[PDB]
Amino acid sequence: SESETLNPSARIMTFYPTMEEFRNFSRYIAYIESQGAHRAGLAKVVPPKEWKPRASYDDIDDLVIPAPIQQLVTGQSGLFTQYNIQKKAMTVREFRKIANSDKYCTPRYSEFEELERKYWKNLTFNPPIYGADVNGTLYEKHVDEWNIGRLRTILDLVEKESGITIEGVNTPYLYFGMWKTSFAWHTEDMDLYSINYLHFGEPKSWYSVPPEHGKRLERLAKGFFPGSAQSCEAFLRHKMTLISPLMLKKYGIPFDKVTQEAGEFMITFPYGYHAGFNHGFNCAESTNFATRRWIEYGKQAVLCSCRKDMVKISMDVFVRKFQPERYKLWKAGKDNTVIDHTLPTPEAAEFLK
Ligand SMILES: NCCNC(=O)c1ccnc(-c2cc(C(=O)O)ccn2)c1
Ligand SMILES: [Cl-]
Ligand SMILES: [Cl-]
Ligand SMILES: [Cl-]
Ligand SMILES: [Cl-]
Ligand code: NA
Ligand code: NI
Ligand SMILES: [Zn+2]
């Protein structure tokens, strides 16, 4: 009850931490969960005014985007599938020139609702190029607060114990966007948390479905794409499936929307389905992270069964370390723990006493 009493509408919450609160990353995540933020699947955190991860973005035009993606989208009536066409490597300068050309630039509009309508109307036309999945960080080597390259959560246990790195998951990715570039409906690999910082440029808009209603979204998607569902136990993980908010509304799927501006963080939570699009030229940085609450999600995540090189993290070391009394039962396939999506991570205890 107690946890199910906080953020009962499961709406997207927005936080404005002081510099003092801001400093301890995992602690602040535990705090925002004590306020019910995770129930939405997504939350915005606006960093203290005097915080900056970089002095200047003037020196990056020569940065290479090795695998720009042209996003072809096919579909109608609010349901689309996106196909990636990889283009030749190009520099940020070359990307921005294209993003801003008349051909690819943001269309005119007054209110967000209008840009949003244009997005869903023109999604299948004039396929844009997304400078996605660029290995690297734009953080200055000395920034200690919310440094996407070193958040210091328990996800570090993966590399620490095995030496394994998974690009964009326990290392940072940069995303250079232009108008109408998209991210399909998905939860994170292994149902992890993610953090996304918009370094600069035009806004990135998001949609989110509360984890407690995640299964309803999957049921709907299966119905809409039965062929894909037959071929894979988790086809949404291909990140190719776009579904408009009008379709979600028409089929009773709860969801919220939020627009992220330059200088703002978005946090997605385990099993929070999210999707969205960029307004124009921008650059975001992101990676995954964990809390103790994630471990159970990791154990129960339903993974892509059809592709080679899909992301899978061995849960063994987390279960041994944080759930030793359940280890044997788990290895014996008898762990029937049921996840309660409303419960905050146990590190939040101190904010709840
Ligand atoms: N292409 C393979 C590598 N992994 C992914 O595509 C992936 C995984 C999880 N989240 C995302 C994601 C992207 C964005 C963005 O493009 O702003 C926003 C929110 N989530 C992307
Ligand atoms: Cl706040
Ligand atoms: Cl299908
Ligand atoms: Cl795709
Ligand atoms: Cl998977
Ligand atoms: Na890569
Ligand atoms: Ni994501
Ligand atoms: Zn698959």
From Swiss-Prot:
Tissue: Ubiquitous.
All residue ranges annotated as the JmjC domain in the record: 140-306
Zinc-finger listed as a keyword: yes
Location relative to the cell: Nucleus
One GO location term (cellular component): nucleus
Domain JmjN per the UniProt entry, residue ranges: 12-54
Biological processes, Gene Ontology terms: cardiac muscle hypertrophy in response to stress; chromatin remodeling; negative regulation of autophagy; negative regulation of DNA-templated transcription; negative regulation of gene expression; regulation of gene expression
Residues that coordinate or bind Zn(2+): 232, 238, 304, 306
Binding site for 2-oxoglutarate: 130, 196, 204, 239
PTM field: Ubiquitinated by RNF8 and RNF168 following DNA damage, leading to its degradation. Degradation promotes accessibility of H4K20me2 mark for DNA repair protein TP53BP1, which is then recruited. Also ubiquitinated by the SCF(FBXO22) complex; leading to proteasomal degradation.
The protein's assembly and partners: Interacts with histone deacetylase proteins HDAC1, HDAC2 and HDAC3. Interacts with RB and NCOR1. Interacts with VRK1. Interacts with FBXO22; this interaction promotes KDM4A ubiquitination.
Summary of the function given for this chain in its UniProt record: Histone demethylase that specifically demethylates 'Lys-9' and 'Lys-36' residues of histone H3, thereby playing a central role in histone code. Does not demethylate histone H3 'Lys-4', H3 'Lys-27' nor H4 'Lys-20'. Demethylates trimethylated H3 'Lys-9' and H3 'Lys-36' residue, while it has no activity on mono- and dimethylated residues. Demethylation of Lys residue generates formaldehyde and succinate. Participates in transcriptional repression of ASCL2 and E2F-responsive promoters via the recruitment of histone deacetylases and NCOR1, respectively.
Protein's name according to its UniProt entry: Lysine-specific demethylase 4A
Species whose genome carries this gene: Homo sapiens
Designated gene of the protein: KDM4A
Residue span relative to the full protein: 3 to 355 of 1064
